[PDB]
Each structure stands twice: as C-alpha cells, then as structure tokens.
C-alpha cells in the first residue's frame, strides 16, 4: 500500500485487544481505500510496552497499545492511575484522563515531550489474582512469591499486602507458573482466558486492585505525513475500536467467572477492607514522593463522582 504501518502488542492472537486491533486495521483499509495496511505484531515480537513506546517516538513503529498509568515512567504524578484501589471504575478512569486539568496536562506532554498522540481510550479490565493456593483473606498472601509486570505500582500492591514480588516479562508467565517457580500472578480475567493461565492455577481469587485502562497511540512522525483526510480516517476508526474494545472487556467480566469454574478453577472473594487498609502506607509514600503534584491529581480523581 501507500503506507505499509505497523501495529506492535503484548497480547496474543486470542485476546480481546487483538480483536479490536484487528477491527481497527480493518476499518483504516476500508475507508482508506487501500492507501493504508496495518499489519500486527503480536506477542510481544517487537518488545515489551516500554520498548514499543520508545519505537513510537523514534517512528519504528506506527502504532501500539500503552496504559495511561505507564507514564510514570516520565511522569512520577501519573502512577495515581494505579494507586491500587483509588480509580473505582471506569466512568472514573475516563473522567481522570479527559476532564482534569491533570489528565489534559498529561495528553498534552505526551504529544510534546514523547512524539506520541492519543487517538482513543478503552477498558482493559479490573486486574485480579490467581495462585497454586487458596487466598480465603489477606493472611494468605503473606509469602507468596507473586509474579508482577516491571512496574512500580504493581510491585507496591504485593510488597504492601505481605507477598514476595518476582518482576517478569508478561511472555515468560506460562512457564513460570507450570513450574511453580513463582506462586501466582495477577492480571484481569481476560488475559486469563487468552494467555490459558487457568491451565496452571487451580484458584482465582478477586482482589480488585488495578483497573487497567488502554490507549491507542500513533507515532507522530507517521500520524505527521497523513494527509488530513487520512488523519481523519485513523482517528475516526480508532475511536470505533476502542467502543468495540472496551464491550468485550465488560461482556467477559459478567461470565468469565462461570466460564473459569467450568475449567476447575476454585474462585474466592476474599474480605478487601484488610487489603484497602494495607495500602495506606503507601498513598503516603506516594504524596511524599511525587509533592504537590501528586498530592493535586490524588485530589482531582477522588473528587470525581463514579455514578453516570
Ligand atoms: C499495554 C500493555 O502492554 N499492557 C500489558 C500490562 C502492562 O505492561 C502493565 O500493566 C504495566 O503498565 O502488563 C500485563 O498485564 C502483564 O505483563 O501482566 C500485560 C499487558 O499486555
């Protein structure tokens, strides 16, 4: 084609944001006529979601997926976006990011300080947590040596509630968990399903501590060479996507659950004030690292009602 572009993930081909991706690259060649092809890359190929955010703003890639808590990484403020149990749900994630003068301030510098432009949010899910044991309360989490992603924030969620956390790479999961070499790990219920966690977790246990949210994201040294029309287009499809996307999360999350028990998987609710109230410290630490900066986007999101 004209423009031959490149769409790069983490997830595999059986998951939801693969399902929407495709969507998307389906709808661009469409109302494109044929001048844009978005080929995937699944599976972490070209590297890890830090990796990838990098090869957008050098223009190796054209697009890929990020969390608007991965910002961090530049911007200490924007972990509030997974402080665990501070964002409620998704109304809330929304409003953080569109309707604070935080969260606009944050669309901003993405564009200028990392050659990066948001074209649409989705639902990704409420991350929860499986294991080779039973979690019947936060007693049972003491020890446990839990997989994390290489991230600051989900490191905190384990230290914080007495668990052992082990960083790796989401591709090396499987394995890890078929060997035992790790306890458990924590993801939403549909990277459960598609990444077949189930096959090596005997109990899933629902913590409700990250709610993961999903961004589509163009380098701007593609979205730049798009004639207007074409900006249009991308930006246009990009939105559809993310409706279609965030559907399957919330479609799944009713039923996973009696999907999972089918498979055997034992399912626990174990009480979450223990685990709330383990977080504390941490707000704390938070405030204390990241100063009124933080302090204001904390105050920004806890003021935002999560009734529609
Ligand atoms: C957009 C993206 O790549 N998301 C990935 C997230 C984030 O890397 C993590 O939550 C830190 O932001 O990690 C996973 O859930 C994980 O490794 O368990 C896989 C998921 O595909």
Same mark, same amino acid.
């Given at each position: ?90 109304? &809330?994630?929304?409003? #953080? ?8 301030? *944050?669309?901003?510098?993405?564009? /200028? $300080? +990392? ?118 287009? &991308?930006?246009?499809? #990009? ?8 559907? *399957?999360?919330?479609?799944?999350? /009713? $039923? +996973? ?52």
């Amino acid at each position: 084609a004209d423009y031959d572009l490149k769409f790069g993930m983490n997830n595999g081909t059986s998951s939801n944001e693969y399902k929407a991706a495709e969507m998307f690259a389906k709808e661009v060649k469409e109302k494109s006529q044929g001048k844009i092809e978005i080929s995937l890359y699944p599976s972490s190929q070209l590297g890890d979601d830090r990796a990838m955010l990098k090869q957008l703003k050098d223009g190796s890639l054209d697009f890929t997926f990020a969390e608007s808590a991965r910002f961090q990484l530049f911007y200490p403020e924007a972990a509030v976006f997974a402080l665990p149990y501070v964002i409620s749900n998704y109304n &809330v994630a929304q409003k #953080a990011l569109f309707d604070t003068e935080f969260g606009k301030d *944050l669309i901003k510098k993405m564009d /200028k $300080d +990392l050659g990066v432009t948001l074209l649409s949010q989705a639902y990704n899910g409420t991350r929860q947590t499986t294991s080779n044991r039973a979690i019947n309360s936060i007693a049972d989490m003491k020890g446990l040596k839990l997989r994390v992603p290489n991230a600051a924030t989900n490191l905190a969620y384990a230290k914080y509630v007495g668990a052992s956390p082990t960083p790796m790479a989401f591709s090396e999961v499987y394995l890890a968990l078929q060997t035992n070499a790790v306890d458990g790990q924590e993801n939403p219920l549909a990277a459960v399903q598609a990444q077949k966690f189930y096959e090596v977790q005997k109990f899933l246990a629902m913590t409700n501590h990250i709610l993961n949210d999903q961004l589509y994201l163009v380098s701007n040294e593609t979205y730049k060479e798009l004639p207007e029309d074409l900006q249009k287009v &991308v930006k246009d499809a #990009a939105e559809n996507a993310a409706k279609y996307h965030t559907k *399957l999360f919330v479609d799944g999350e /009713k $039923d +996973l659950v009696t999907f999972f028990e089918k498979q055997g998987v034992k399912i626990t609710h174990p009480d979450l004030v223990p685990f709330k109230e383990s977080m504390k410290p941490y707000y704390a630490e938070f405030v204390k690292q990241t100063g009124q900066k933080g302090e204001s986007a904390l105050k920004q999101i806890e003021a935002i009602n999560p009734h529609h």
